[PDB]
Amino acid sequence: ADWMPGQPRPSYLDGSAPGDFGFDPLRLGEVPENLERFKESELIHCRWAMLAVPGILVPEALGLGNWVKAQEWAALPGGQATYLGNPVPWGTLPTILVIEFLSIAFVEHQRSMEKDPEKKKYPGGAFDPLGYSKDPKKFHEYKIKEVKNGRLALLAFVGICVQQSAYPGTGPLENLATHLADPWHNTIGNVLIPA
Amino acid sequence: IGPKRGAKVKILRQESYWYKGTGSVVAVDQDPNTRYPVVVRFNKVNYANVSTNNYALDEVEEV
Amino acid sequence: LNPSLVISLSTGLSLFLGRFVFFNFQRENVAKQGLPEQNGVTHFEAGDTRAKEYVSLLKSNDPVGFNIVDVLAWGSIGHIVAYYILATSSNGYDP
Amino acid sequence: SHSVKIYDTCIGCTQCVRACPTDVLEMIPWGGCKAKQIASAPRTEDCVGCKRCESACPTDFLSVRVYLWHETTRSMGLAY
Amino acid sequence: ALRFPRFSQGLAQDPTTRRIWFGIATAHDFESHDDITEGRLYQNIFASHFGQLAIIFLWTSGNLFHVAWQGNFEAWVQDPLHVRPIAHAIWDPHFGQPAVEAFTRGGALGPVNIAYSGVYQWWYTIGLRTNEDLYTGAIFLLFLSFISLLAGWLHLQPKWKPSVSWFKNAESRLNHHLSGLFGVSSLAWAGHLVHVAIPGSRGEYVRWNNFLSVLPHPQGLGPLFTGQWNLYAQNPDSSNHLFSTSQGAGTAILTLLGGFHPQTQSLWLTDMAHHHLAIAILFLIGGHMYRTNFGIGHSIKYILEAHIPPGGRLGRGHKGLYDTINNSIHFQLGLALASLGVITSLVAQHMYSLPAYAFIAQDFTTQAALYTHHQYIAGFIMTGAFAHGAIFFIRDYNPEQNADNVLARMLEHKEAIISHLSWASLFLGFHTLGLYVHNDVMLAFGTPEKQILIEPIFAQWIQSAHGKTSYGFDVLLSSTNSPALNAGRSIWLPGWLNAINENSNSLFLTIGPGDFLVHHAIALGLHTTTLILVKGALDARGSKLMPDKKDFGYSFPCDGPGRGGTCDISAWDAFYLAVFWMLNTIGWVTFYWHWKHITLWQGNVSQFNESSTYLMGWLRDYLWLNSSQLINGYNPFGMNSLSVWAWMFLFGHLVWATGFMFLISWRGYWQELIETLAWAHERTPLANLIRWRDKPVALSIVQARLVGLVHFSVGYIFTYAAFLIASTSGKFG
Amino acid sequence: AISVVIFHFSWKMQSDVWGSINDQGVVTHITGGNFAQSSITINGWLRDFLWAQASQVIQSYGSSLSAYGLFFLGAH
Amino acid sequence: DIAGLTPCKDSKQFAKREKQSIKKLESSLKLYAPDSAPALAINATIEKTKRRFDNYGKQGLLCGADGLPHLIVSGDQRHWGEFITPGILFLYIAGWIGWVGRSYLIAIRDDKKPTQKEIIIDVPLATRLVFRGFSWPIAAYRELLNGELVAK
Ligand code: CLA
Ligand code: CLA
Ligand code: CLA
Ligand code: CLA
Ligand code: CLA
Ligand SMILES: CC1=C(/C=C/C(C)=C/C=C/C(C)=C/C=C/C=C(C)/C=C/C=C(C)/C=C/C2=C(C)CCCC2(C)C)C(C)(C)CCC1
Ligand SMILES: CC1=C(/C=C/C(C)=C/C=C/C(C)=C/C=C/C=C(C)/C=C/C=C(C)/C=C/C2=C(C)CCCC2(C)C)C(C)(C)CCC1
Ligand SMILES: CC1=C(C/C=C(\C)CCC[C@H](C)CCC[C@H](C)CCCC(C)C)C(=O)c2ccccc2C1=O
Ligand code: SF4
Ligand code: SF4
Give the separation between CA C52 and CA C31, rounded to whole angstroms. Answer: 17
The SS3 of residue D32 is coil
The SS3 of residue E239 is coil
Kindly tell me the burial class for residue A12, based on how many C-beta atoms sit within 10 Å of its own C-beta (0-12, 13-18, 19 or more). Answer: middle
CA distance B39 to chain E (A): 21
Give the separation between CA E254 and CA E271, rounded to whole angstroms. Answer: 6
C90·E172 Cβ contact <8 A: no
Pair E106, E84: CB distance under 8 Å: yes
Give the separation between CA C63 and CA C20, rounded to whole angstroms. Answer: 11
Pair A62, A82: CB distance under 8 Å: no
The SS3 of residue A54 is helix
The crossing angle, in degrees rounded to 10, of helices E269-286 and E185-192 is 160
Sorted by sequence, the CB contacts under 8 Å of residue E505 that are 6+ apart come out as E260, E265, E361, E499
Neighbours of A125 (CB within 10 A): 8
Q: How far is CA F49 from CA E411, E622, G142, in A?
A: 54, 19, 65
Q: Is B49 left (phi over 0), alpha (psi -120 to 50) or beta?
A: left
Pair A110, A120: CB distance under 8 Å: no
Give the separation between CA E377 and CA E387, rounded to whole angstroms. Answer: 15
Kindly tell me the burial class for residue A168, based on how many C-beta atoms sit within 10 Å of its own C-beta (0-12, 13-18, 19 or more). Answer: exposed
A75·C95 Cβ contact <8 A: yes
Neighbours of E199 (CB within 10 A): 21
Give the separation between CA E456 and CA E489, rounded to whole angstroms. Answer: 28
Neighbours of G33 (CB within 10 A): 8
User: B28 has which bridge partners?
Assistant: B38
The number of residues making up chain E comes to: 733
Check if E667 has its Cβ closer than 6 Å to any atom of ligand 8.
Answer: yes
Look at chain E and report how many structural domains it folds into: 1
Give the separation between CA F42 and CA F55, rounded to whole angstroms. Answer: 19
CA distance E370 to chain A (A): 46
The SS3 of residue E693 is coil
Sorted by sequence, the CB contacts under 8 Å of residue B16 that are 6+ apart come out as B53, B55, D60, D61, E547
Half-sphere CA count of E436, side-chain side, radius 13 A: 24
Please report the sign of the dihedral spanned by the C-alpha atoms of residue E210, residue E212, residue E214, residue E216: positive
Give the separation between CA E598 and CA E603, rounded to whole angstroms. Answer: 9
Give the separation between CA E469 and CA E454, rounded to whole angstroms. Answer: 20
Residues of chain F by 3-state class (helix, strand, coil), percent to 5: 60, 5, 35
| Closest CA relative to residue E324, chosen from E384, E387, E393, E385 | E393
Q: How far is CA E196 from the centre of its chain?
A: 29
Neighbours of B34 (CB within 10 A): 18
| Closest CA relative to residue A98, chosen from E715, G100, C12, E664 | C12
User: F28 has which bridge partners?
Assistant: F20
Give the separation between CA C81 and CA D5, rounded to whole angstroms. Answer: 69
Which atom number of ligand 4 is nearest to the Cα of residue E437? Answer: 44
Give the separation between CA A9 and CA A24, rounded to whole angstroms. Answer: 8
| Closest CA relative to residue A24, chosen from A46, A3, A45, A44 | A3
Kindly tell me the burial class for residue E708, based on how many C-beta atoms sit within 10 Å of its own C-beta (0-12, 13-18, 19 or more). Answer: buried
| Closest CA relative to residue D35, chosen from D63, D9, D54, D13 | D13
Q: Do chains E and A touch (3 or more CB pairs under 8 A)?
A: yes
Pair C75, E472: CB distance under 8 Å: no
Taking contacts as CB-CB distances below 8 angstroms, the residues of chain E near A33 are: 310
In one-letter notation, the amino acid at residue E208 is W
Neighbours of F1 (CB within 10 A): 5
Pair E663, E705: CB distance under 8 Å: yes
Pair D22, D48: CB distance under 8 Å: yes
Give the separation between CA E266 and CA E271, rounded to whole angstroms. Answer: 11
Data resolution in angstroms: 2.4
Sorted by sequence, the CB contacts under 8 Å of residue D25 that are 6+ apart come out as D4, D16, D17, D39, D40, D41, D43, D53, D64
User: CA-nearest residue of chain D to B11?
Assistant: D60
Pair E560, B47: CB distance under 8 Å: no
Give the separation between CA E155 and CA E39, rounded to whole angstroms. Answer: 12
Pair D24, D2: CB distance under 8 Å: no
Kindly tell me the burial class for residue E240, based on how many C-beta atoms sit within 10 Å of its own C-beta (0-12, 13-18, 19 or more). Answer: exposed
Domain that holds residue E399: 1-733
Alpha helix locations (H) across E168-299?
170-176, 185-192, 198-201, 222-226, 269-286
Partner C contacted by E301 (CB < 8 A): yes
The SS3 of residue E390 is helix
**DSSP conformation letters of E563-615:** GG--TT-SHHHHHHHHHHHHHHHHHHHHHHHHHHHHHHHTT-THHHHHHTTSH
| Closest CA relative to residue E71, chosen from E56, E80, E82, E84 | E84
Which DSSP symbol is given to E184?
I
Residues of chain E by 3-state class (helix, strand, coil), percent to 5: 60, 5, 35
The number of residues making up chain F comes to: 76
Kindly tell me the burial class for residue D29, based on how many C-beta atoms sit within 10 Å of its own C-beta (0-12, 13-18, 19 or more). Answer: exposed
Give the separation between CA E521 and CA E527, rounded to whole angstroms. Answer: 10
Q: Where is E447: in which H helix or E strand?
A: none
Three-state SS string over chain C comes to CCHHHHHHHHHHHHHHHHHHHCHHHHHHHHHHCCCCEECCEECCCCCCHHHCCCHHHHCCCCCCCCCHHHHHHHHHHHHHHHHHHHHHHHCCCCC
Q: Which of E386, E418, E423, E425 to mutate to test the pocket of ligand 4 (most atoms within 8 A of CB)?
A: E425
Sorted by sequence, the CB contacts under 8 Å of residue E733 that are 6+ apart come out as E364, E365, E597, E598, E600, E601, E602
User: CA-nearest residue of chain E to G62?
Assistant: E455
Kindly tell me the burial class for residue E647, based on how many C-beta atoms sit within 10 Å of its own C-beta (0-12, 13-18, 19 or more). Answer: middle
Strand pairing of D3-6 and D26-29? Answer: unpaired
The crossing angle, in degrees rounded to 10, of helices A136-166 and A32-61 is 60
Domain that holds residue B46: 1-63
Q: Where is E707: in which H helix or E strand?
A: helix E701-729
In one-letter notation, the amino acid at residue A190 is N
Domain that holds residue C61: 1-95
- From the CA of C16, the nearest ligand is 6
Sorted by sequence, the CB contacts under 8 Å of residue E224 that are 6+ apart come out as E232
User: G69 has which bridge partners?
Assistant: G63
φ, ψ for residue D30 (rounded to 5)?
-150, 150
The SS3 of residue E698 is coil
Give the separation between CA E525 and CA E382, rounded to whole angstroms. Answer: 13
Give the separation between CA G97 and CA G130, rounded to whole angstroms. Answer: 8
Sorted by sequence, the CB contacts under 8 Å of residue F12 that are 6+ apart come out as F35
Kindly tell me the burial class for residue G27, based on how many C-beta atoms sit within 10 Å of its own C-beta (0-12, 13-18, 19 or more). Answer: exposed
Give the separation between CA E40 and CA E113, rounded to whole angstroms. Answer: 44
In one-letter notation, the amino acid at residue E105 is R
Pair E177, E78: CB distance under 8 Å: no
Look at chain C and report how many structural domains it folds into: 1
Sorted by sequence, the CB contacts under 8 Å of residue E349 that are 6+ apart come out as none
Which DSSP symbol is given to E257?
-
Give the separation between CA C81 and CA C11, rounded to whole angstroms. Answer: 8
Taking contacts as CB-CB distances below 8 angstroms, the residues of chain F near E632 are: 47
Give the separation between CA E5 and CA E26, rounded to whole angstroms. Answer: 9
Q: How far is CA E134 from CA E63, E64, E82, E553, in A?
A: 9, 6, 21, 49
Strand pairing of B60-62 and B52-55? Answer: unpaired
| Closest CA relative to residue A19, chosen from A150, A154, A134 | A150
Q: How far is the CA of E539 from the centre of ligand 3 (A)?
A: 28
| Closest CA relative to residue E493, chosen from E521, E457, E465 | E465
Partner C contacted by E398 (CB < 8 A): no
The crossing angle, in degrees rounded to 10, of helices E131-154 and E38-70 is 160
Sorted by sequence, the CB contacts under 8 Å of residue B34 that are 6+ apart come out as D32, D33, D34
| Closest CA relative to residue E231, chosen from E254, E210, E248 | E254
Taking contacts as CB-CB distances below 8 angstroms, the residues of chain A near C13 are: 102
The number of residues making up chain A comes to: 195
Neighbours of A190 (CB within 10 A): 12
Neighbours of E255 (CB within 10 A): 23
Pair G8, G57: CB distance under 8 Å: yes
Which atom number of ligand 7 is nearest to the Cα of residue E388? Answer: 36
Kindly tell me the burial class for residue B22, based on how many C-beta atoms sit within 10 Å of its own C-beta (0-12, 13-18, 19 or more). Answer: middle
Task: For residue A99, tell me if it sits in a domain.
Answer: yes
Give the separation between CA E373 and CA E371, rounded to whole angstroms. Answer: 6
Partner E contacted by C52 (CB < 8 A): yes
Give the separation between CA E81 and CA E78, rounded to whole angstroms. Answer: 9
Pair G95, G137: CB distance under 8 Å: yes
Neighbours of E185 (CB within 10 A): 13
Q: Name the CA radius of gyration of chain C, rounded.
A: 18
Sorted by sequence, the CB contacts under 8 Å of residue E484 that are 6+ apart come out as E476, E477
Give the separation between CA A176 and CA A183, rounded to whole angstroms. Answer: 9
Give the separation between CA E282 and CA A173, rounded to whole angstroms. Answer: 46
Q: Where is E395: in which H helix or E strand?
A: none
Q: Extract long-range pairs of G103-108: CB within 8 Å, 24+ residues apart.
A: G103/G129, G103/G132, G104/G129
φ, ψ for residue D21 (rounded to 5)?
-90, 0
- From the CA of D66, the nearest ligand is 9
Q: How far is CA C50 from CA C39, E42, E295, in A?
A: 18, 17, 15
Kindly tell me the burial class for residue A14, based on how many C-beta atoms sit within 10 Å of its own C-beta (0-12, 13-18, 19 or more). Answer: exposed
Sorted by sequence, the CB contacts under 8 Å of residue G106 that are 6+ apart come out as none
Which DSSP symbol is given to E290?
B
| Closest CA relative to residue E599, chosen from E719, E498, E728 | E728
| Closest CA relative to residue E46, chosen from E353, E371, E329, E426 | E329
